[PDB]
Design a protein around this motif. Structure first.
Motif, PDB file in Angstrom:
ATOM      1  N   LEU C  21      -5.626  -3.192   7.820  1.00  0.00           N
ATOM      2  CA  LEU C  21      -5.675  -2.124   6.824  1.00  0.00           C
ATOM      3  C   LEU C  21      -4.271  -1.676   6.423  1.00  0.00           C
ATOM      4  CD1 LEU C  21      -8.560  -0.010   8.367  1.00  0.00           C
ATOM      5  CD2 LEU C  21      -8.637  -1.238   6.180  1.00  0.00           C
ATOM      6  N   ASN C  25      -2.683  -2.118   2.774  1.00  0.00           N
ATOM      7  CA  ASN C  25      -2.087  -0.999   2.039  1.00  0.00           C
ATOM      8  C   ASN C  25      -0.651  -1.277   1.595  1.00  0.00           C
ATOM      9  OD1 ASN C  25      -4.483   0.273   2.432  1.00  0.00           O
ATOM     10  ND2 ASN C  25      -3.670   1.890   3.740  1.00  0.00           N
ATOM     11  N   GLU C  36       1.972   5.654  -2.829  1.00  0.00           N
ATOM     12  CA  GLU C  36       1.741   5.357  -1.419  1.00  0.00           C
ATOM     13  C   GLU C  36       0.598   6.181  -0.808  1.00  0.00           C
ATOM     14  OE1 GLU C  36       2.712   7.615   1.226  1.00  0.00           O
ATOM     15  OE2 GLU C  36       1.841   6.246   2.703  1.00  0.00           O
ATOM     16  N   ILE C  39      -3.513   5.370  -1.506  1.00  0.00           N
ATOM     17  CA  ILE C  39      -4.202   4.133  -1.144  1.00  0.00           C
ATOM     18  C   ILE C  39      -5.147   4.357   0.037  1.00  0.00           C
ATOM     19  CG2 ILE C  39      -3.922   1.765  -0.348  1.00  0.00           C
ATOM     20  CD1 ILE C  39      -1.115   1.832  -1.667  1.00  0.00           C
ATOM     21  N   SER C  41      -8.222   2.964   2.304  1.00  0.00           N
ATOM     22  CA  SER C  41      -8.985   1.789   2.696  1.00  0.00           C
ATOM     23  C   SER C  41      -9.760   2.014   3.985  1.00  0.00           C
ATOM     24  CB  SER C  41      -8.055   0.602   2.862  1.00  0.00           C
ATOM     25  OG  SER C  41      -7.145   0.820   3.905  1.00  0.00           O
TER      26      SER C  41
ATOM     27  N   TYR D  49      -9.962   3.049   9.393  1.00  0.00           N
ATOM     28  CA  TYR D  49      -9.425   3.414   8.082  1.00  0.00           C
ATOM     29  C   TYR D  49      -7.914   3.624   8.132  1.00  0.00           C
ATOM     30  CZ  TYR D  49      -9.583   8.106  10.049  1.00  0.00           C
ATOM     31  OH  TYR D  49      -9.411   9.212  10.850  1.00  0.00           O
ATOM     32  N   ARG D  50      -7.273   3.484   6.972  1.00  0.00           N
ATOM     33  CA  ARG D  50      -5.856   3.795   6.802  1.00  0.00           C
ATOM     34  C   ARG D  50      -5.615   4.319   5.395  1.00  0.00           C
ATOM     35  NH1 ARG D  50      -6.085   3.094  11.440  1.00  0.00           N
ATOM     36  NH2 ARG D  50      -4.673   1.974  12.864  1.00  0.00           N
ATOM     37  N   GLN D  51      -4.823   5.375   5.286  1.00  0.00           N
ATOM     38  CA  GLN D  51      -4.437   5.880   3.981  1.00  0.00           C
ATOM     39  C   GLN D  51      -2.930   5.775   3.808  1.00  0.00           C
ATOM     40  OE1 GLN D  51      -5.951   9.744   3.119  1.00  0.00           O
ATOM     41  NE2 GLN D  51      -4.894   9.941   1.149  1.00  0.00           N
ATOM     42  N   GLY D  52      -2.516   4.955   2.850  1.00  0.00           N
ATOM     43  CA  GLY D  52      -1.111   4.683   2.626  1.00  0.00           C
ATOM     44  C   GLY D  52      -0.485   3.810   3.694  1.00  0.00           C
ATOM     45  N   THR D  53       0.836   3.885   3.794  1.00  0.00           N
ATOM     46  CA  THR D  53       1.596   3.064   4.727  1.00  0.00           C
ATOM     47  C   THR D  53       2.426   3.911   5.695  1.00  0.00           C
ATOM     48  OG1 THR D  53       3.470   2.838   3.195  1.00  0.00           O
ATOM     49  CG2 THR D  53       1.711   1.196   3.046  1.00  0.00           C
ATOM     50  N   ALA D  54       2.529   5.206   5.416  1.00  0.00           N
ATOM     51  CA  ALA D  54       3.312   6.105   6.263  1.00  0.00           C
ATOM     52  C   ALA D  54       2.586   6.435   7.569  1.00  0.00           C
ATOM     53  CB  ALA D  54       3.649   7.382   5.505  1.00  0.00           C
ATOM     54  N   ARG D  58      -3.813  11.134   7.780  1.00  0.00           N
ATOM     55  CA  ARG D  58      -4.468  11.668   6.591  1.00  0.00           C
ATOM     56  C   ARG D  58      -5.984  11.565   6.656  1.00  0.00           C
ATOM     57  NH1 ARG D  58      -0.055   8.232   3.400  1.00  0.00           N
ATOM     58  NH2 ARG D  58       1.316   9.901   2.613  1.00  0.00           N
TER      59      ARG D  58
END
Lengths: 293, 117, 118, 118, 293, 117
Positions: C21, C25, C36, C39, C41, D49-54, D58
């Motif tokens: 994931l 991203n 950023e 996104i 997912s 889940y993952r939101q963004g790359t940071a 979130r």
């Protein structure tokens, strides 16, 4: 009275008319099926002609086709074949192509008027069913030709192929009408099938050709005929046996003589390592061993 | 093609989700529209759900996703075909009739990506 | 944008769902098409699944990227190809044969789209 | 119509998933566009889940409303906004920052739509 | 060489071919009619292909169709029927639907070129005549099945039905092939007709079913069969009589016994007020009065 | 439909005007275009008439009025059909051949009014 509506109805009218003809060449079950279809087509025309104001065929009618399709689908196991294998199946192929023309007209109406989508799906399923029905008919004439060959009825055999039966049809065991005549011992049937394109070297599920069958069962006259029409005298079955190994083991010397005259190899080894000659030696058959060496 | 079947937890099937997916794939393949190996379906049981606002209710919905290029009759027949299979697979659920529905949609072919690992 | 990745339970990955994931991203962000933080997912493991009708063990991996409309065909196509490459690399194997990896890219209606921040 | 609501596992609601679904169904019915019994909604908790790359944690909440085609832009737009109000108010927190709430409204092809009652 | 012209001619040509086939399945009269039509279609193509430069069919040709239509129209008295009731009528229904396709093409040409209006009227009348002719054929197979049943020939009735004859056709008196078998006394026939869908409770113009006929005329074997296939043992005719009233009044005791075993009501009153029992009493029939009470 | 038949007084008929009207209505009904009870016809004898300017001449003309919606073949066939019935009804009249003609016209459906008392 927009043309797409008129043409769709007119074409459906044309469709049911051809169906009306076809149902006089089919059995009782298919006849009943076609009559229900005629009723559905009429029902569809009611919807189209009224621009969707009148309810057309129900989803149960589509499912009704699907059930029949699933039934007949398991009866059909296609290579590619030309339309109209038999007189009867030709009638269905004609209905199929008309149904497709009907579908295009009704689909055009659906795209332009937003109605009849269920009817279009019905007609689509109809075409698929009609295809199968034609193939099933050809398979059934195939089976009747197999029966004729197994029974030993020389006239039935000629008749079945004259009406479109496939001389290269096969049973669940891979035996064609030609294998059946070769095994049972009916030279006249062997001859008329070869004459109309039966594959002299077709293999059954045991890897046997009609020549293996004839050679093993002492059918000298049939062996001669099969070779004349191009049988592979050295064809090997699943286990490496040739018609010669079979004729040798059975002691059928006259057949051995015929096979050898057509280039049979007395030194061929099966998958076990046995040759036709070595077999004459293992069985203690001094006269056969003289013929094979 | 990608087929997703979702059922409420209180929905009772005649057969297992697995058997239903197999039947669905057969229904799809029997259409002659699809390669056998390409037909991919999954089934999910819904544990957190509400139907309406007033009652014990079950439902069954599927969405068939195909690459574009098929006509209305084909998509309509595919939907009806699946709905029939799914509807017949329902044994009950809730205190009233069970709604069974199927939608068919098209995927954009040009942007579609595929590889086999 | 929203990305969903679904994998059969019998599908083996080289990395954790989390890592995939994150990589996904990054692949999307690198496109220059997305903020950023936007996104979003998720990854789902499928327990009840069938591929085809044959009695053969099969695994598959599928994703669908949902974006607001306004991007051209090259962009959507590249985004799909980009994700498929990432997903494909993450596959170790599964079933008795090759694993099918596919990605869809679809557009959401911008005009009806609604968003809030809490 | 069919409504799906997805929330990240780290997202905290003021109400239960069930209450949110009931409120959403009421919001949909109040539009006058739907029969009460026809509204089917489900809620899913996202564990992978993952939101963004940071590295920042979130939370997010997303829904998609599926309807049969035939409604105009104002209706689809209002339905989105309406659901967003219901969803947004249900959010207590989650993650290290504000929670993104979004709703899509999409149309199903009516002509190919199949339905039976068992 | 504009497409509407070419397509109109090509379609009329296609029409002529189907007519050419059909005329080999009809009698001498219809054959002659179809040949005249083939000449008219050729005449029409002459007009269309020449964009009106060559004269087409005359008003006499339209009237010629109309006279035939009026003749055959009085022979046709339609419920709705499916196309292709018989093999022969199917051939004409095919010609009918093609003719309609031909009409649509010619109408397009007329609208665009201003020619062929008379030809279009002709083709319109043609499709009407073809419809009727097909129905007449089905009526005639109907009449031959009625004859077969009256004669008592079990092969004829199977053949007529196999070829499309309506098992429920009726004469001017409302009697179907099944009523004829029951009235005349051919157990073999009453059975095969029921087997192929004859309505066991069809009413003739007197309100009688085949069971009323059998009961009145002493046909014991017929009564047994009709009841087995669902005849209404207590069906009343126009005057309120049941088959029991008829069997009783005629003194046919064995039938009375059969009817009673299947639930016939001995106390039913006709419109005059008579019951089957009271009738056995009025005739002084001590044995009948016993079985009825 | 409404049919009017006008004949010159010097025109000789084979049958009475009554027979003509009944046959005309049958000819119209046989088209399959009309309800039996819907067909209204009348016959008129022309006492004050001239044909040309130079002679003893008779003529027979009918005008069929129908609601719009029928095609060219139908209107053309209706005319020819009536002409056949009308022509056969003429026994003679004048010192030359008798002209028999029929026109078919369409009434505007939308503005059409009807009631049954």
């Amino acid at each position: 009275k927009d043309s797409p509506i008129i043409e769709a109805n007119g074409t459906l009218d044309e469709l049911t008319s051809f169906i009306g003809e076809a149902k006089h060449y089919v059995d009782e079950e298919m006849k009943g099926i076609l009559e229900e279809i005629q009723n559905d087509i009429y029902k569809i025309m009611g919807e189209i002609g009224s621009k969707g104001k009148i309810e057309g065929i129900s989803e149960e009618r589509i499912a009704w086709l699907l059930k029949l399709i699933l039934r007949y689908m398991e009866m059909v196991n296609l290579s590619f074949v030309l339309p109209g294998g038999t007189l009867e199946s030709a009638k269905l192929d004609v209905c199929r192509t008309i149904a497709r023309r009907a579908l295009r007209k009704v689909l055009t109406v659906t795209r332009e008027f937003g109605i009849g989508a269920e009817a279009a799906a019905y007609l689509l399923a109809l075409s698929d069913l009609l295809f199968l029905l034609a193939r099933v008919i050809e398979i059934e004439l195939g089976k009747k030709l197999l029966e004729a060959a197994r029974a030993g009825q020389d006239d039935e055999v000629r008749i079945l192929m004259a009406n479109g039966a496939d001389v290269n049809a096969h049973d669940d065991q891979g035996s064609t009408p030609l294998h059946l005549a070769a095994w049972i011992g009916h030279p006249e049937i062997v001859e008329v099938l070869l004459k109309h394109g039966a594959d002299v070297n077709a293999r059954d599920t045991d890897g046997w050709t009609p020549l293996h069958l004839a050679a093993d069962n002492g059918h000298l006259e049939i062996v001669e005929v099969l070779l004349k029409y191009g049988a592979d005298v050295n064809a090997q079955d699943a286990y490496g046996l040739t018609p010669l190994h079979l004729a040798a083991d059975r002691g059928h010397l006259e057949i051995v003589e015929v096979l050898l005259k057509h280039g049979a190899d007395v030194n061929a080894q099966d998958k076990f390592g046995k040759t036709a000659f070595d077999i004459s030696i293992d069985n203690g058959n001094e006269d056969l061993a003289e013929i094979l060496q | 093609p990608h087929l997703v079947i979702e059922a409420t937890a209180n929905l009772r099937l005649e057969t297992s989700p697995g058997e239903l997916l197999e039947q669905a794939n057969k229904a799809l393949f029997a259409s002659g529209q699809f390669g056998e190996a390409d037909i991919k379906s999954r089934f999910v049981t819904l544990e957190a759900y509400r139907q309406g606002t007033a009652v014990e209710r079950a439902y069954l919905h599927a969405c068939l996703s195909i690459l574009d290029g098929r006509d209305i009759a084909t998509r309509t027949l595919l939907g009806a075909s699946l709905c029939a299979v799914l509807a017949e697979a329902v044994a009950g659920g809730g205190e009233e009739g069970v709604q069974v529905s199927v939608e068919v949609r098209e995927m954009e072919r040009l942007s579609y990506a595929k590889r086999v690992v």
